[PDB]
Amino acid sequence: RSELTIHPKEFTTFVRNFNPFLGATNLHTTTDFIYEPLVVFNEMHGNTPVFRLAENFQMSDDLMSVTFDIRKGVKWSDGEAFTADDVVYSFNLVKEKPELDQSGINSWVTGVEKVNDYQVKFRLSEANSNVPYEIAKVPVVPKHVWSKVKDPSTFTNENPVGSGPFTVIDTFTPQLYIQCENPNYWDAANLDVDCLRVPQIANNDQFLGKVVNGEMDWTSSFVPDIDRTYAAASPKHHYWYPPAGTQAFVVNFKNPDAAKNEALTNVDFRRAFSMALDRQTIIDIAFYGGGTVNDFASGLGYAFEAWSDEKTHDKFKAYNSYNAEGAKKLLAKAGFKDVNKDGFVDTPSGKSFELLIQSPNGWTDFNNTVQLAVEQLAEVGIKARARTPDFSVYNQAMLEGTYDVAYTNYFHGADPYTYWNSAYNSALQSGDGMPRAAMHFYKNEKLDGLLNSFYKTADKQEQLEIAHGIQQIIAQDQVTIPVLSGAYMYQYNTTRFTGWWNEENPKGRPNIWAGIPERLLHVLDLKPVKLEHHH
Ligand SMILES: CC(=O)N[C@@H]1[C@@H](O)[C@H](O[C@@H]2O[C@H](CO)[C@@H](O)[C@H](O)[C@H]2NC(C)=O)[C@@H](CO)O[C@H]1O
Ligand SMILES: [Ca+2]
Ligand SMILES: [Ca+2]
Ligand SMILES: [Ca+2]
Ligand SMILES: [Cl-]
Ligand SMILES: [Cl-]
Ligand SMILES: [Cl-]
């Protein structure tokens, strides 16, 4: 039997938890691989829908409702029948318990109803023509189970009943678990992989040793000097790094320290911070050239240059370009003066301060970015130092607003909305299932208004104009400090399997992370290599 060795997420130890709604504590082979979505949107290729457990969808009248045609003939892993009430239950479960909304679905779908056994209708809080994409983000769980569970909020779901291709827990150790083919998988014919083999790997260092020794199949980790360390180790070691989303330094607007709050809430300081940074050098040293300078004050990025209002871009690009003397003169003009002779600037009220900059433990490319930033900042007289907390500590500090500055990446869509909405919609700064992206706690009502209306009208020109408005608001206030546009790191080994996506076969986002539903489509294309013979 063919075992595919994947690595979606670092863990120090595996804790059995396959609850699809617990993204911050579950195992990361749960969405897609255990719970198949209704539709997979191919984000790299214009968000083209690939219909899965749903056959078709159709929006309404006024962009204010939608129906999904549930495919019949689809059975759960236990034997039961995938139907509309599963969808129905699932969506009610998220409105009842908004802790389980990881997407923001509850601010869109205002109710959900079983048209019949194979059709569901959703009604909206407002016109959003992109709401089928949002709808697809919600996990759909078997009603004949989850309805009767004590607390879904804490159900660890250790023997999952799933619709996806890999639902069987074959083995489970704290250092290894193997996930095996659903015996009622509807697309079983298309599937040529037996099992998912998930080893426990805690950081990029432990990962490095395995991957260069040919021990992995499908991974998406950072690999330093990848040509001379991994590519050079075997001709079987391949990779494909298509362009990804924005990475930025995010500053806390609600920092509880008086002195730090005084610096971070000041647009002149954020701009000076930004001008102190040498973006291309960060890309070259920390990422070994694997990235693109982002000198958009709005964070838009060169992948979306087509969307860009070039007036706005040019007006603020100087604040987002390496210029240490410019940084120093801005600090002086703004009044951040060193008044206690240590060479580091103090706030307008005369207070000394040091910025603690955080990135997740083990994410070494980001750790080294922060450390380059600390030195670049010191050259213009801004005192800072690095911290590398465990991801969950890192994440919590942002949700709780206790951090000073955080370096982070964002999810990346087929248009600027995925980035701009997740990074700036102030509604996403509240709610316990919310990711870290918006947690700068900068709030602008006009901005939320523009974000909320982006898919409200089918006018391509008007929509572009809304994007110009968003771009201008964010750039003027230098809300974050955008640094670069990164890559979808992806490594594959041709030793044991074939059919991989790559430059000559770019079928979609190739990565194995949770939050890349396309990985479901990717594993279906994979096929074992004929290595040995019968007798
Ligand atoms: C948008 C987002 O948050 N993506 C997360 C990934 O960045 C993250 O992958 C990790 O990315 C680090 C930063 O480049 C890498 O150094 C690290 O190797 C990589 N880890 C793995 C296992 O690929 C993943 C997993 O932590 O979570 C994504 O959501
Ligand atoms: Ca296939
Ligand atoms: Ca098969
Ligand atoms: Ca000082
Ligand atoms: Cl901009
Ligand atoms: Cl484009
Ligand atoms: Cl366009």
Author numbering: 1 to 535
What's written in the study?
A similar effect was observed in F437A, that is, the hydrophobic interaction with the N-acetyl methyl group of the reducing-end GlcNAc was likely eliminated by the F437A mutation; however, in this case, the hydrogen bonding network formed by the Arg436 side chain was partly affected by the Ala mutation of Phe437. F437A also showed a relatively large change in the binding affinity. By contrast, the reduction in hydrophobicity in the F437A mutation may not only have weakened hydrophobic interaction with the N-acetyl methyl group of the reducing-end GlcNAc at the site 2 but also added a conformational restraint to Phe411. The F437A mutation may have also affected the hydrogen bond network formed by the nearby amino acid, Arg436, with the N-acetyl carbonyl group of the same GlcNAc and with a bound water molecule. These subtle changes resulted in a rather large impact on ΔG° (ΔΔG° = +4.1 ± 0.3 kcal mol−1). The specificity toward GlcNAc may be mainly attributed to these two amino acids, indicating that mutational study of Arg436 and Phe437 may lead to specificity-engineered sugar-specific SBPs.
